[PDB]
């Protein structure tokens, strides 16, 4: 049962993780290198032992797909998760005094749609500039499913100093066999308590989107971590969470036939039979 | 405490039982699993595989070649290591539409990406001094000044440069990690030839980790090997069946023979493999 991998990873960090401080100095238990496999066949891995912010997951992903790098554009949809990184104060602390509030720099949206183009600001038109990794991935899946190079890469060493934050999700790779689309994520840093459930849901959702566009069935999502960590103030709550028995995973329904990845709207998606334990 | 090499052998076993038929660019066909991970300890042992002799000289010369930033197959060939030659030949370069390119010029491959990520590639002989991001040195620097950092990444995967490369890199990126004065490394390898590539691949990044650990005054920790498309070629099944029958010998040690200050200063003679006891080399073909 898929959720047990996530719970197993939490268990492994609690027993075997080492004390390690972070950028803030708040401190973590930490393991380097982990891998879980979540099936996507007739099930969607939205974690049940604690409710995941589904709306956040879906809006953030649509925001990525539009190529936006404007925190305000996601904030308008009710999803505040990138606001603090776009605030006047946070931007100033990075030496970006000339930058408009909300401008996160060349993050996910830009990298996925315009890798290697020259970043100016969040409002600039980038049409036909840089590599549209998202579409090349869709195209390669359609014309040459056997290809071992189906990669979308958010890690851009040249652009790192211009970003409000360097991406947690360095890259993902897709794979096709037996009409099934699988995806593997390389996530360099994982907050196991707060980030990871949301992170698992994002890339599972991305895979469902691309599978729908390409006429394939969802296969596996493979979650690979670098620095897998639990914050010390999360140990006691997570101990409570480990006690709960997972309910069956919900399903994800895609409510109409959609032709291009850019056409997906939030209302196209329905989470069915989601039954989480209280927060 | 079981032998590290058993993971590699376990992965081969898993692909044989559970892998699915999947064709490649050549159409030769593979058994294939997507997503695997092994952990090889580097503490007083070096994971040079014993059930089949690994081309150690190749491993070491290739890595020094990367570190110099070279993208010239001829420069590695001169060291007795032919592994990149076919990808640099007039014929192979022409088949990719690179008719104007000098023989040996592999495009913006590992060396260029590690030392000059994001610079404009011209040719293999061009001077790239102070152009692009020197990922290799930034990694060394970050390890020294801020070991807790979760962004110690060296990335070879450059979407803008892909169409200019003779081959897109198998090793998309690696990440480093420090705790308790131990340096660990994880490799994201998008495609793995389990029979011919993987043992060599494991040895490269283990060696890289030993190099950086030496430069930074740290001890080797773990090497974490993550695979995308992990595959065995069909003409390798029978030879690998022979290999699975062998019992691993203890892993050799790697000695670094003098104190070395900067990663560029390493020479081949600085390195000694001690107590390596491989079984006789097995016969396999190629793509």
Curated annotation (Swiss-Prot), chain A:
Catalysed transformations (reactions): dUMP + (6R)-5,10-methylene-5,6,7,8-tetrahydrofolate = 7,8-dihydrofolate + dTMP
Outcome after substituting residue 60 to K: In DKCD; uncertain significance
Domain of life of the organism encoding this protein: Eukaryota
Active site (record annotation): 168
Cross-link (Glycyl lysine isopeptide (Lys-Gly) (interchain with G-Cter in SUMO2)): 260, 265
Phosphoserine modified-residue sites: 87
Xref: PROSITE patterns: THYMIDYLATE_SYNTHASE
InterPro entries to which the protein is assigned, alphabetical: Thymidate_synth/dCMP_Mease, Thymidate_synth/dCMP_Mease_dom, Thymidate_synth/dCMP_Mease_sf, Thymidylate_synthase, Thymidylate_synthase_AS
Top-level EC class as recorded in UniProt: transferase
Binding residues annotated for (6R)-5,10-methylene-5,6,7,8-tetrahydrofolate, in chain numbering: 191
Pathway of action: Pyrimidine metabolism; dTTP biosynthesis
Gene3D superfamilies according to UniProt: Thymidylate synthase/dCMP hydroxymethylase domain
Pfam families, per database record: Thymidylat_synt
GO cellular component, one term: cytosol
Intrachain S-S bonds: none
Organism: Homo sapiens
Entry protein name: Thymidylate synthase
Record-listed dUMP binding positions: 23, 148-149, 168-169, 188-191, 199, 229-231
Subcellular location: Nucleus; Cytoplasm; Mitochondrion; Mitochondrion matrix
Illness: Dyskeratosis congenita, digenic: A form of dyskeratosis congenita, a rare multisystem disorder caused by defective telomere maintenance. It is characterized by progressive bone marrow failure, and the clinical triad of reticulated skin hyperpigmentation, nail dystrophy, and mucosal leukoplakia. Common but variable features include premature graying, aplastic anemia, low platelets, osteoporosis, pulmonary fibrosis, and liver fibrosis among others. Early mortality is often associated with bone marrow failure, infections, fatal pulmonary complications, or malignancy.
UniProt family annotation: Belongs to the thymidylate synthase family.
PANTHER family, per database record: THYMIDYLATE SYNTHASE, THYMIDYLATE SYNTHASE 1
GO biological process: DNA biosynthetic process; dTMP biosynthetic process; dTTP biosynthetic process; methylation; negative regulation of translation; tetrahydrofolate interconversion
EC number(s) on file: 2.1.1.45
Function summary: Catalyzes the reductive methylation of 2'-deoxyuridine 5'-monophosphate (dUMP) to thymidine 5'-monophosphate (dTMP), using the cosubstrate, 5,10- methylenetetrahydrofolate (CH2H4folate) as a 1-carbon donor and reductant and contributes to the de novo mitochondrial thymidylate biosynthesis pathway.
């Amino acid at each position: 049962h898929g959720e047990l991998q996530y719970l197993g990873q939490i268990q492994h960090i609690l027993r075997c993780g080492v004390r390690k401080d972070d950028r803030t100095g708040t401190g973590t238990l930490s393991v380097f290198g982990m891998q879980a496999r979540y099936s996507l066949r007739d099930e969607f891995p939205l974690l049940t032992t604690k409710r995941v912010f589904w709306k956040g997951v879906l809006e953030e992903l649509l925001w990525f797909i539009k190529g936006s790098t404007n925190a305000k554009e996601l904030s308008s949809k009710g999803v505040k998760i990138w606001d603090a990184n776009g605030s006047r104060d946070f931007l100033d602390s990075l030496g970006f005094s000339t930058r408009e509030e909300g401008d996160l720099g060349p993050v996910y949206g830009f990298q996925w749609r315009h890798f290697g183009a020259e970043y100016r600001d969040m409002e600039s038109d980038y049409s036909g500039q840089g590599v549209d990794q998202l579409q090349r991935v869709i195209d390669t899946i359609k014309t040459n499913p056997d290809d071992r190079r189906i990669i979308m890469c958010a890690w851009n060493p040249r652009d790192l100093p211009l970003m409000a934050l360097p991406p947690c999700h360095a890259l993902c790779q897709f794979y096709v066999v037996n009409s099934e689309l699988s995806c593997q994520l390389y996530q360099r840093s994982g907050d196991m308590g707060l980030g990871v459930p949301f992170n698992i849901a994002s890339y599972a959702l991305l895979t469902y989107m691309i599978a729908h566009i390409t006429g394939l069935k969802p296969g596996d999502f493979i979650h690979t971590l670098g620095d897998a960590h639990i914050y010390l103030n999360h140990i006691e709550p997570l101990k409570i969470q480990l006690q709960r028995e997972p309910r069956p995973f919900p399903k994800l329904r895609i409510l109409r036939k959609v032709e291009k990845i850019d056409d997906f709207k939030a209302e196209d998606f329905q989470i069915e039979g989601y039954n989480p334990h209280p927060t």
